[PDB]
Amino acid sequence: LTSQMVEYGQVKRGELGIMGTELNSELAKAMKVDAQRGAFVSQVLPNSSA
Amino acid sequence: QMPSLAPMLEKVMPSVVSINVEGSTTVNTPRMPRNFQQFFGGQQQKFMALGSGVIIDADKGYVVTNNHVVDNATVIKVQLSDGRKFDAKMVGKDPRSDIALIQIQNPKNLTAIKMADSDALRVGDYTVAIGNPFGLGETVTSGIVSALGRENFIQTDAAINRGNSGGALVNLNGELIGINTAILAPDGGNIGIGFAIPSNMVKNLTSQMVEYGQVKRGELGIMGTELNSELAKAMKVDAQRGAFVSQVLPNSSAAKAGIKAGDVITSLNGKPISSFAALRAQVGTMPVGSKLTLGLLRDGKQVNVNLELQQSSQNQVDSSSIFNEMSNKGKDQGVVVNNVKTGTPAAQIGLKKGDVIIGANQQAVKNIAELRKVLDSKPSVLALNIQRGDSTIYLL
Amino acid sequence: GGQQQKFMALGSGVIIDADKGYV
Amino acid sequence: AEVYNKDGNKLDLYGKVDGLHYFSDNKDVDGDQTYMRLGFKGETQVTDQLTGYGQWEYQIQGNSAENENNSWTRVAFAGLKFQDVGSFDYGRNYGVVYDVTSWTDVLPEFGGDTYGSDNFMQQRGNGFATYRNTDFFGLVDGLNFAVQYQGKNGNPSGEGFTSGVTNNGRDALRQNGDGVGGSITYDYEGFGIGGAISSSKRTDAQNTAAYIGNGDRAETYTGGLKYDANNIYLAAQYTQTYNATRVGSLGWANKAQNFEAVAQYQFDFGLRPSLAYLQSKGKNLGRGYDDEDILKYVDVGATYYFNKNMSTYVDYKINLLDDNQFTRDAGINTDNIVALGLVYQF
């Protein structure tokens, strides 16, 4: 991780740009999600690839 | 003399009926005393609803109406325009479209409206709505086609200020072009103009209720909303431009196949998904058993899977002409029963949470239309050949 | 604005039939 | 202190620092109790008849170490007043029952504790919509009335509750359903007479087996009397409540009868001695508790006013409750307390 900061300015880690959490969150219930066993998408980040 | 809509209305009215629903629901128990200068924050309660409907099959006594009227009905009464009264039973309903089907019990000399082809509608076209605005009876109001969506909800200015979303939308020829609805759910009442389901969609959704017991609409079983919600912020979501997954529904395909709250779907079969909206509508253009691969976002997650019948459109005490919440399972693979209740009249009959019914009390029950087709022909001896996966018992 | 509860009462009475012990 | 007054807007910035210490055998109240309060009251002239206002008050404890912060909002509301008609305001405010019970809440440190905060419409609480009419359209000097509504404050959000949630939800001892109340007071010369009534729906979270005093609604009925002239202050209030009075941490009293009385005198040289008696008697409590004293004490104290900005006081709570199973279970203090305070205010 350290060499990357040196030779690039930052570490090359790509993001899927989604933001969210588990299927227990108040929003997974307050929005009633069918088939719960995965990642809940609370929001898709702006100008992102997602 | 002078022009008038009365001549075609006389050929139309015999097909429009009034509907009186009586039913109950669960309300919270009032806490007393009551303090009106104190902004706070189980028992069945009877309620009465009333709406309009349209006779769509004179022989079978099939009447189309809004789901917001018959929902939760225990007793549904129908009164023809000539004043004859009948009883009716639920045959189908679909909360998405806010459309429901019922059947007059013991029809005699009925008139059905002719359905026109929704697809030929154009904006300057003339429109006439018929409904029961404030209960005081059957009111007709006129106007034109305002917006043709293009789901194709029809928009028309033949509505009513402060009144409840009536029913029939008819063209100048007396043919059914749409059923007026209420987009102000669990309310009824309009936004200022009128929204109707187009006649062609009504025909389509309606036949499904008849020939299957419910409409074949598969759900992805996720539940969630936009990226503005308090939970999208309270949980800080990276890259916001999609559908926020607040929760993955239990025993679902989203659940089964893989997915967890938080991920924000970004696409569906390659195409961009910028809002729950976009998604909720796209998954609604796909019948059960379909396969739709979508891209999720956590760091960069994506999967492919097949969905099953939704849970919104289901049946209750109308499958067995008797009285007592099943729905269809996959293709013609019997009728799978869902969440049983507390009174347990049907659970008491040896029916658990996931009990299929391929045995028509003796025969084939690939679906609720068939099943119900038998619990109506031979009301004598009944042995439900149910098999909830393994156990293949035969209760009465 | 269910369970049994024991209570005690006390009062007087008058013998009205000596043979039958009626009070 | 008025720190701004220009073009029809006024801002008063006020507060106090109370250097305060408790002495008690009860170590949960014993020790440093230092605190400060800060607030503002603003008013803006809209027309000759219409004024807009807002008020905010905040308490910050001064008795904790620097790795923690114990502070809260006492009141926060905005309102409109129309000359000779009335006023309306909305926010965190005092319940209308306090219009009457405030009359005995005049002790140097203690007092005012036959009820509490976030306790239906009895004292401070969230979501009060309050309408007030002063002097009856300006046609009866001294006669005031008020009608108040409180919206539901329910279960916390994001904690897995499937009913009764509100955005600002909280523990059941501090919840309330919708409520309505009213107050009437009349003051002629030195004398005062008043009455108030409140009725609040109780939430499902409050009506579980985990709490005594289950009931559909919380009701309170209050009468009060006051005399305030010739350097003498006398006041008394009596309140009957139903499923409304907390019994420590146990829940609420099926019925309670609350009484408070105070006598005070103001010497010319600045000393103001005070004598008071408070009691709260609970009835039909459940769990075998039957009839029990919830509160019972005599308060003797005095304040010395150096001026309108500096004062010092001693207050002695002579606690007549005895240590028993009931008070132990509820966590009710039964020990005496001596408070000594030194207060700067602006």
CSV table of C-alpha atoms in Angstrom, one decimal, chain D residues 187-191 228-229:
chain,number,residue,atom,x,y,z
D,187,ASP,CA,-55.5,36.7,39.0
D,188,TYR,CA,-57.0,39.6,40.8
D,189,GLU,CA,-54.7,41.9,42.7
D,190,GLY,CA,-52.5,39.5,44.7
D,191,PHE,CA,-54.8,36.5,44.5
D,228,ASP,CA,-48.5,37.1,45.9
D,229,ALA,CA,-48.3,40.6,47.5
